[PDB]
Amino acid sequence: RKLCSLDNGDCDQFCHEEQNSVVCSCARGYTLADNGKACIPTGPYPCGKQTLE
């Protein structure tokens, strides 16, 4: 458990080890937060989110 194998590399979603070191990304409808790890929804009904309202 080094990079992506260690707690998903601290990524919210997609994790990939590129030339060593972690690189996170997000599904369509999300944008990688400034921390390069979190995924922020682009609209009102982002994918994979149970509808609260």
From Swiss-Prot:
Q: What is this protein called?
A: Factor X light chain
Annotated disulfide bonds: 4-15, 11-24, 26-39
> Which parts of the sequence belong to the EGF-like domain?
1-40
- Which residues of the intact protein are shown? 126 to 178 of 488
Organism annotation: Homo sapiens (Human)
Judging by the UniProt lineage, the source's domain of life is Eukaryota
